[PDB]
């Protein structure tokens, strides 16, 4: 089988409130203002797809949120994002591979050239046959073209593919192509799914 | 009672391997070299006590580890340190206070002026009556003077004080003054200690 895993809130817990905390720490802007002004629109989509530079992405968010930061300062806080591995999921991924299943990661990424990001973590790279990243592809979930890129490059049909993601639009985008798509509700979805099938 | 909690590996999980990962990411220096060259000696003690500047501390570690980083780049990776709250411990701290016990934090800190650090987290500040930090005091655990500073400033005797820390030297330093010192072996030590006594 081909197994596709989302990264954010599937393989790792991730929390961008830490970043807002760090920008609040530096700017003294009340956290609540940053929480209110921080939202993922067009500049995110473009950055995810590599259509605008890190600097332009920084500039757009700083304009939205009235952040008087240099690019370096932006990056410095961006670096602070909370990321914890889910070791249960990592172990399952390793197990699937040694049973000759194909295991890959599919992630919309706002990594910057100056930051250390989950897709760069040795434990996540060593757990996957391949990692597919939006910025490299010029595509993002839930666009059909990104799922198709993966089926095509891995050589599997929709019906031989299982996809895990916590975002319901992402799940819909995959379903449209006949991928078996598992909504990740929380940390039990994936251990359950694989309970009997592994151990 | 006066309850004193260590921060690192007591209230929060903390992992500086994330920092080494980030410096490896930037420098391309193999992680294993950084792991081998990274050790907490005199420059740490001094920085903890506020005796040398952030820059000097950076300069010393970069010299030790052959890190060709600016101060900004050092800080940028330092910012990456893994920190997760232990919500069990945070809740216990809140509970102790509302029962009229005094609850404080005692931490040797290598915060920089440019970073967002656990002692600055709203959830940790809001959980404690007071937070005692090495850099502010010019003292560090396990020196007797730092424990004495806390007893003196809070107005409690050793025998009315309970201290939690995972470092055995820190625990010894407290014991020497007749503080009740609880070695934190793992994440159960503290929930157990308070199981019956709270709920
Ligand atoms: Ca990087
Ligand atoms: Ca700060
Ligand atoms: Cl992701
Ligand atoms: Cl202020
Ligand atoms: Cl994603
Ligand atoms: Cl498309
Ligand atoms: Cl600490
Ligand atoms: Cl390289
Ligand atoms: Cl400490
Ligand atoms: Cl002393
Ligand atoms: Mg996700
Ligand atoms: Mg500790």
Curated annotation (Swiss-Prot), chains A, B:
CDD domains, per database record: HAD_sEH-N_like
EC number(s) from the headed UniProt entry: 3.1.3.10
Annotated GO MF terms: glucose-1-phosphatase activity; magnesium ion binding; manganese ion binding
Use of this protein: Is proposed to be a useful catalyst for hydrolytic transformation (e.g. removal) of alpha-Glc-1-P from complex substrate solutions containing multiple sugar phosphates.
Signal sequence coordinates: none
Textual note on the cofactor: Magnesium. Can also use other divalent metal cations such as manganese, cobalt or zinc.
Pfam families: Hydrolase (PF00702)
Keywords: Hydrolase, Magnesium, Manganese, Metal-binding
Family matches, as NCBIfam families: HAD-SF-IA-v3, PRK09456.1
PANTHER family: ALPHA-D-GLUCOSE 1-PHOSPHATE PHOSPHATASE, FLAVIN MONONUCLEOTIDE HYDROLASE 1, CHLOROPLATIC
Protein's name in the database: Alpha-D-glucose 1-phosphate phosphatase YihX
């Amino acid at each position: 089988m081909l197994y596709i895993f989302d990264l954010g809130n599937v393989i790792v817990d991730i929390d961008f409130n830490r970043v807002l905390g760090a920008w609040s720490d530096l700017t003294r802007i009340p956290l609540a203002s940053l929480k209110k002004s921080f939202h993922m629109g067009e500049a995110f989509h473009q950055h995810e797809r590599g259509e605008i530079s890190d600097e332009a992405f920084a500039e757009a968010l700083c304009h939205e949120m009235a952040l008087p930061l240099s690019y370096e300062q932006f990056s410095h806080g961006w670096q602070a994002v909370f990321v914890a591995l889910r070791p249960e999921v990592i172990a399952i991924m390793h197990k699937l591979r040694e049973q000759g299943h194909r295991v890959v990661v599919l992630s919309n990424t706002n990594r910057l050239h100056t930051t250390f990001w989950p897709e760069e973590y040795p434990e996540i790279r060593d757990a996957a046959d391949h990692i597919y990243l939006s910025q490299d592809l010029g595509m993002r979930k839930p666009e059909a073209r990104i799922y198709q890129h993966v089926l095509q490059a891995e050589g599997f049909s929709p019906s031989d593919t299982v996809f895990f993601d916590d975002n319901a639009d992402n799940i819909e985008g995959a379903n449209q192509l006949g991928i078996t798509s598992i909504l990740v509700k929380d940390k039990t979805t994936i251990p359950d799914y694989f309970a009997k099938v592994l151990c």
